[PDB]
Design a protein around this nucleic acid. Structure first.
Lengths: 48, 377, 52, 49, 43, 132
RNA sequence: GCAGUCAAGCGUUCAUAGCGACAUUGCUUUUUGAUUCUUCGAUGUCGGCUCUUCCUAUCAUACCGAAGCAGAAUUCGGUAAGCGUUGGAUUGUUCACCCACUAAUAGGGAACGUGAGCUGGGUUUAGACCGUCGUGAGACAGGUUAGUUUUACCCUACUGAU
RNA sequence: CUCUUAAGGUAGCCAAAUGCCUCGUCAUCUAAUUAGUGACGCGCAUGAAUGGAUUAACGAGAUUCCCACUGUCCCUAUCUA
RNA sequence: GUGAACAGCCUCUAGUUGAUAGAAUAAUGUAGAUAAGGGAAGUCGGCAAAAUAGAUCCGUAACUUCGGGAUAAGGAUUGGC
């Protein structure tokens, strides 16, 4: 039988699993695209 | 009022069109349909003659009338076999229920066939008004016979017109006097024939005469209608038509359902008919019966007067005991409109009309208010 | 508009499926205004009394 | 009866398994998140009163 | 109930047969108007 | 008909009975709908200060009663956040009745009028005495 | 229930823009019948609430083709199920029917989804009144009232954790 | 006058706990009412101690509506044993 | 002792201090609670909960078998010295 009253899903499926992270310092999965005309500089920074 | 004097005189110039369907002559007419075809065209033309009234007058809005042809035939048989054609009128509006135009149809096959007007509940009116009532009936020269259907009356507290101002008893001596010989020779009993409107006691009266309840309340929808006769006297038979309504005239459309013309249990636009009960009663009279203490007339906040409105009566009567609406409570005016208009016709909210005269009607009408009550001291 | 009618048995068809047998020219004034497309949007259906 | 802060219907008869997309109680919080487009207003120095 | 009295039972409360009972019945039938030579309201 | 308005806190669901600020005879208004409301299962659509609601008159003149007609909220009791910072709220709820264009049937308004209603609706600011 | 073919004719003058008489070939298993194969040492037998997923025969949104498409508004068709598809009065209702908003309020499946998740209004125990039938016990799938809804600590599945 | 071996529903009452067709018909209440009330009665199959109709009071009885009130809900949150 | 009260709450004489315990404060429960604005839209159904409550004074309708309805409704006041 059908759902009888349509409604959107509760929650987001691209954020599974809800499991505890491996470390309190979260990793950076990806850095910006390299542009080798510009001078040398860093891409991120650590802080509290 | 200026509005009262003009709208009375407009009706008098148009009274001649109303007539009836009249049964044109049929001498032998042996027929499967040729008597029926002969009788259609009289009512079909009479239906057309009332249709021209709507173009002729503006805001003329007249009484409903029996548009069914078969109801009119039941009038035709009763007016034919009877030597006396009799009209029952209410006494609260004596001019309205009477039709003078039907009496023209009585004198057609006359051989001294007569007209009679018997008018009920005379004890309700007063002693003073019936003296003023007796002047108009003789001046148009038809009849006036008041009565009240009680075997023992309780009417506690110049001869010329005051001799018939007393109404009559329960006696049938007053129908016994007009016609002594019969119009057909062979039957020993004569007959009398009764014609009146529904919601006027043509069934309430002659229930009490025969005492066996043969006349009972109005007929079924699925039938033709009926026609019934009853024998009660040494020397008269009774006949009554199925109750129907004659097209005389109507004004303001509220007075119809305020009287017994239109049904109270079917009404739309209750503001008009509840407005007519408002001004035609004084304030402390309703305050004695129901005990409403209405006042609320805005009484030096918006205007000057002691007159009521259609709103503030229905609200205050139903701001008493209960009567609230769904969703939000705003006092439920239309439910209270039934119980006031039913007490108008039943006679708790009694009123007497001005007697008719050529154009004029008074602003200050005669009244009746008893100072005593079972609760008021 | 269009109003259906039993030629033999004198009935009136309501919009869904009904066959209300009404008295002719008395209360058909009351059975039509359901079938009419117009609803309660029109002001106050103050009066209605059909002509011949 | 026996609890109102729940989910009523976990699944249908067929398939005879609980799917991966239903809501089910467990750990909340302490996840790795990335939030983009935050605009810097002020970069203040250390030895600066 | 029908076991308790000969007027008992049924899907209404009615007796079912004539309540007037003959003089020459047995013990257990005589429950009702016994040997009624008349009944009803007197005239 | 309704222009851009910054979101403020929804304080009037369906079934609310707000007052009637104008002088068109009506005493209070019964909210049955909000124009431009959303869609969510089991969710009552709610109004705000300056929304346009469909409403009926439960108390007042008998001519105005028993018909559904659009109305505009001019006061609100739930506190809302203005962008400049402050949280404010009136004492009671209020609404004025209108045609579906947005023009107003009454002549004047008693009591104060919220400022985000006077910017959005041109006719309400013409008839407003006190603007916050 | 849905989709084709063939063309007499309607479409103010033209068979196929849109429609399609007389006939004819199919699909589908959300209707309802037919049959009695499986269960009577019991598969908890209506409806709603709650929640996930699937289908396309597409109501809305994306891009397109045709019109008797000037614009506006609309009707017919293609790819397309990625994403949305509601708030209320009445009834136990599924269904129905109105009022209102909306971009739009499309139709369906999963043991007629889902009762060791619920509620118990309804149906189908025992109490009781009414109506018609029965001489009578009683009958009615006719109407109205009152009526206990049991256990998971095992295994797998799933969600978190070693 | 008369057919069924008697008599032909009287006084009252109603879509009622009694009406199949049926969500009867017409008003009314509501933005909307298969519910509620007021009427109408050829009533499948109401009716006079198998008692009829009417009733102040009384009711852990059945039904509809309003005022006051509120996490029953919009829409969930928090604290204690 | 408070109070109209042998009600509820706290004390004297008399009696007991027994009902498996320790450490933590996750969910879901059971028992007791609180809530912004709206106020029955929730639901078969105001089911559960909330609001009114003692006393003194004014004031009390329809209807009625004249006994009642009645604490009707509705509106003020309340400590200490």
């Amino acid at each position: 039988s059908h759902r009888k009253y349509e409604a959107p899903r509760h929650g987001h499926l691209g954020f599974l699993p809800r499991k505890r992270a491996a470390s309190i310092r979260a990793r950076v999965k990806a850095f910006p695209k390299d542009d080798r005309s510009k001078p040398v500089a860093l891409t991120s920074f650590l802080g509290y | 009022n200026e509005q009262r004097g003009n709208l009375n005189a407009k009706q008098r110039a148009l009274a001649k069109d109303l007539i009836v369907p009249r049964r044109p002559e049929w001498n032998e007419g042996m027929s499967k349909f040729q008597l029926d075809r002969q009788e259609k065209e009289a009512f079909l033309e009479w239906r057309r003659k009332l249709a021209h009234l709507q173009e002729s007058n503006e805001d003329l809005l007249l009484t409903p009338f029996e548009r069914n042809i078969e109801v009119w035939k039941q009038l035709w048989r009763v007016v034919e076999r009877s030597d006396l054609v009799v009209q029952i009128v209410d006494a609260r509006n004596p001019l309205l229920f009477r039709s003078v135009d039907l009496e023209r149809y009585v004198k057609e096959s006359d051989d001294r066939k007569a007209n009679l007007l018997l008018v009920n509940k005379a004890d309700l009116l007063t002693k003073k008004q019936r003296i003023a009532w007796a002047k108009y009936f003789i001046s148009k020269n038809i009849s006036f016979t008041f009565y009240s259907a009680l075997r023992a009356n309780q009417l506690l507290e110049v001869k010329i017109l005051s001799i018939d101002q007393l109404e009559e008893l329960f006696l049938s001596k007053a129908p016994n006097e007009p016609l002594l010989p019969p119009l057909p020779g062979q039957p020993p009993l004569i007959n009398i024939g009764l014609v009146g409107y529904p919601n006027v006691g043509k069934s309430s009266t002659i229930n009490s005469l025969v005492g066996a309840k043969k006349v009972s309340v109005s007929s079924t929808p699925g039938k033709t209608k009926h026609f019934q006769t009853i024998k009660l006297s040494d020397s008269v038979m009774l006949c009554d038509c199925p109750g129907l309504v004659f097209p005389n005239f109507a004004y303001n459309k509220g007075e119809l359902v305020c009287n017994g013309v239109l049904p109270i249990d079917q009404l739309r636009d209750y503001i008009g008919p509840a407005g007519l009960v408002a001004e035609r009663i004084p304030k402390y009279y309703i305050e004695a019966i129901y005990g409403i203490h209405i006042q609320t007339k805005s009484r030096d906040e918006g205007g000057n007067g002691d007159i009521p409105t259609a709103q503030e009566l229905l609200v205050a009567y139903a701001r008493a005991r209960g009567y609230m609406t769904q969703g939000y409570g705003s006092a439920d005016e239309p439910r209270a409109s039934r119980y006031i208009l039913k007490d108008y016709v039943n006679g708790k909210l009694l009123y007497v009309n001005p007697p008719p005269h050529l154009e004029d009607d008074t602003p200050y009408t005669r009244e009746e208010c008893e100072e005593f009550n079972k609760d008021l001291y | 508009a269009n109003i259906s009618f039993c030629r033999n048995c004198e009935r009136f068809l309501q919009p869904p499926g009904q066959w209300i047998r009404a008295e002719l020219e008395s209360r058909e004034l009351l059975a039509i205004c359901l079938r009419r497309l117009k609803g309660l949007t029109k002001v106050r259906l103050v009066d209605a009394s059909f002509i011949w | 009866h026996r609890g109102l802060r729940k989910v009523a219907c976990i699944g249908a008869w067929h398939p005879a398994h609980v799917m991966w997309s239903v809501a089910r109680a467990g750990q909340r919080g302490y996840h790795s998140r990335t939030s983009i487009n935050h605009k810097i207003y002020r970069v203040g120095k250390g030895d600066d009163e | 109930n029908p076991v308790d009295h000969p007027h008992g039972g049924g899907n209404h409360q009615h007796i079912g047969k004539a309540s007037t009972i003959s003089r020459g019945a047995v013990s257990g039938q005589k429950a009702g108007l016994i040997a009624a030579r008349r009944t009803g309201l007197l005239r | 008909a309704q222009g851009t308005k910054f979101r403020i806190s929804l304080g009037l669901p369906v079934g609310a009975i707000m007052n009637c600020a104008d002088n068109s005879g009506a005493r209070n208004l019964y909210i049955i709908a909000v124009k431009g409301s959303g869609s969510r299962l089991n969710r009552l659509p709610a109004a705000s200060l300056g929304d346009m609601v469909m409403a009926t008159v439960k108390k007042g003149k008998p001519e105005l009663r028993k018909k559904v007609m659009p109305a505009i909220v001019v006061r609100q009791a739930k506190s809302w956040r203005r962008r400049d910072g402050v949280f404010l709220y009136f004492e009671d709820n209020a609404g004025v009745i209108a045609n579906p264009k947005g023009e107003m049937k009454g002549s004047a308004i008693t009591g104060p009028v919220g400022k985000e209603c006077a910017d959005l609706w041109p006719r309400v600011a013409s008839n407003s005495g006190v603007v916050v």
